[PDB]
Design a protein around this ligand. Structure first.
Ligand SMILES: [Cl-]
Ligand SMILES: [Cl-]
Ligand SMILES: [Mg+2]
Length: 572
């Protein structure tokens, strides 16, 4: 069961430009304003190197330096079409990527002499911000999702292989976010943008779009993209982040997205016409369906941003946008998939993922050994830095096992740090916390081992433990309101679990194990092998649980609790 492996850094932010050339060669093009180039693997995605593009490959007339054009293979002709993320022209290939490239004109002909500035004025220019062209209807139609400023997603449609184009009648829209508590302001408004499109086996098109809601929104088309159903929430959580859909050779559907919940909007968020800060872009997730979208499995973290705890995160190597969001995939073989993900040269990666890992049923961790690669523990310094970023601090730290062992364990407590406070924005991120991903399940058993730290505790000191269906920030105290199951561990007057109104004591200065066995709308809580009580489901979930979330509850600085091991098994 092989773990995801990082194999290279793509030469552009992920989302466009990754393309299989043949059985062993894969290329990732770049958005360079200079002579075109690409990163190439000649061993089916394991090793990579830069290479300059041949003289016939057109430069990037449109687009932007951080993003490559989209290159898609026409399934009938095996030639390629190239479209920029913004501006520029439509190029069709003749003789493959290294052959002859022709530009589409406004009349619908192919222009061979595009190096001439005078001949580029008559070239077709598709408007809006575009994503990946998709060939549908047995390869006879190509559609390109685009979104302008404001109107939502629509589709450029061509039944001529890219020669002539029209626009869909309608598209995908999504509603504005409403400032209601826990929010103190409105999220930046995105009207169903940057859509990904997948053709279903029965001919229906499924569009999945990025919104200002808690999840991507979706719409369906029964006419190959000409008209679309009323938009509705999808099952893929995530705000203001991109989705990507793909299909493996055997028909399995793959979903890639950032399965996160952003911090609630603060008191200075704005009117929704601009973004103040991104707090949900430090991971990427994968889910698969073997039955045409009926049921999904996985929902696993592909990768966590390696710099996510850094106090200079927002400004390391310039201020531009960064993170693990945005993605594109290429199947390597029956069991393995290559994924390009992320933004900014320090964060974007090429990753190989295995199906058998996506379908695994168990996961175990020890905080001292796995903190860096598996645990989300960062809190934010709530001061705007760079472009819509916050610098970070680890909200929890590893300490020596108080029993005298060699283990390091994670101390989770209310911090004393004035940098974690912004009075005007009215946010306080001083509650330490930690969260960990495991394979999705509507039934499961999670066990964790914990201990009360010896020292002074505040009156409300303790831990809120939550099972959630997406990644909540380690310092998000409202997680319990969205959790599938949640309960507090309270340290005062004496340590006890609170299950509804039943108090279940446990001793200080000793390691204890809690297990949660959930099935349908109930979870049975056990303490040291003995049943302690049952929890009713707090929130229905379309998918099931895939995260456990721990956060301190103290309102004053305190010693808190220690967290050692977590073990999860799903699908009983
Ligand atoms: Cl171009
Ligand atoms: Cl700055
Ligand atoms: Mg905002």
């Amino acid at each position: 069961v092989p773990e995801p492996e990082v194999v290279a850094t793509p030469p552009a932010d992920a989302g466009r430009g990754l393309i299989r050339v043949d059985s062993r060669e894969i290329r990732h093009y770049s958005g360079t304003r200079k002579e075109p180039d690409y990163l190439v693997s000649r061993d089916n995605g394991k090793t990579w190197e830069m290479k300059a593009a041949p003289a016939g490959y057109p430069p990037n007339y449109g687009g932007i330096p951080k993003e490559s054009p989209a290159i898609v293979r026409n399934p009938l002709t095996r030639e390629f079409i190239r479209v920029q993320p913004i501006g520029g022209f439509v190029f069709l290939s003749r003789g493959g990527l290294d052959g002859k490239w022709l530009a589409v004109t406004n009349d619908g002909k192919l222009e061979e002499d595009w190096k001439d500035p005078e001949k580029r004025k008559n070239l077709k220019k598709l408007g809006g911000i575009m994503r990946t062209p998709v060939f549908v209807n047995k390869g006879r139609r190509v559609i390109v999702p685009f979104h302008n400023m404001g109107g939502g997603t629509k589709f450029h449609i061509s039944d001529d292989g890219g020669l002539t184009w029209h626009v869909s009648r309608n598209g995908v829209t999504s509603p504005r976010h409403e400032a209601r508590p826990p929010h103190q302001g409105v999220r930046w408004f995105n009207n169903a943008v940057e859509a990904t499109v997948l053709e279903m086996k029965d001919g229906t098109l499924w569009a999945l779009a990025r919104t200002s809601q808690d999840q991507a929104w979706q719409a369906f088309s029964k006419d190959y993209g000409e008209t679309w159903s009323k938009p509705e929430p999808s099952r893929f959580f995530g705000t203001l982040t991109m989705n990507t859909l793909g299909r493996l050779d055997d028909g399995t559907i793959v979903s890639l997205w950032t399965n996160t919940m952003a911090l609630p909007e603060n008191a200075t968020a704005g009117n929704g016409t601009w973004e103040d800060v991104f707090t949900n872009r430090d991971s990427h997730h994968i889910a698969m369906s073997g039955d045409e979208g009926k049921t999904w499995y996985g929902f696993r973290e592909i990768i966590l941003d390696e710099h996510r705890n850094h106090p200079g995160y927002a400004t390391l190597d310039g201020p531009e946008d960064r993170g693990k969001h945005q993605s594109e995939m290429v199947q390597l073989d029956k069991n393995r998939i290559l994924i390009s993900l992320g933004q900014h040269k320090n964060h974007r990666r090429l990753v190989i993922v295995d199906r058998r890992w996506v379908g695994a049923k168990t996961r175990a961790t020890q905080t001292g050994k796995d903190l860096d690669s598996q645990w989300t523990i960062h809190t934010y310094i709530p001061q705007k830095k760079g472009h819509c970023s916050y610098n970070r601090k680890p909200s929890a730290e590893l300490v020596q096992d108080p029993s005298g062992g060699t283990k390091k364990v994670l101390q989770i407590k209310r911090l004393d740090d004035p940098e974690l406070v912004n009075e005007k924005s009215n946010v306080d991120y001083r509650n330490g916390g930690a969260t960990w991903n495991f394979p999705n399940g509507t039934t499961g058993l999670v066990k964790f081992r914990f201990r009360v730290v010896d020292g002074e505790q505040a009156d409300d000191s303790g831990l809120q433990v939550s099972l959630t269906d997406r990644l909540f920030n380690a310092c998000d105290s409202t997680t319990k309101d969205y959790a599938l199951f949640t309960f507090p561990i309270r340290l005062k007057p004496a340590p006890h679990l609170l299950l509804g109104m039943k108090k279940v004591p446990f001793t200080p200065g000793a390691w204890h194990e809690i297990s949660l066995l959930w099935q349908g709308g109930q979870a049975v809580v056990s303490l040291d092998g003995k049943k302690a009580g049952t929890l009713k489901m707090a929130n229905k979930s379309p998918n099931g649980a895939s995260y456990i979330h721990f956060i301190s509850t103290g309102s004053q600085p305190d010693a808190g609790i220690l967290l050692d091991t977590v073990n999860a098994r799903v699908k009983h």
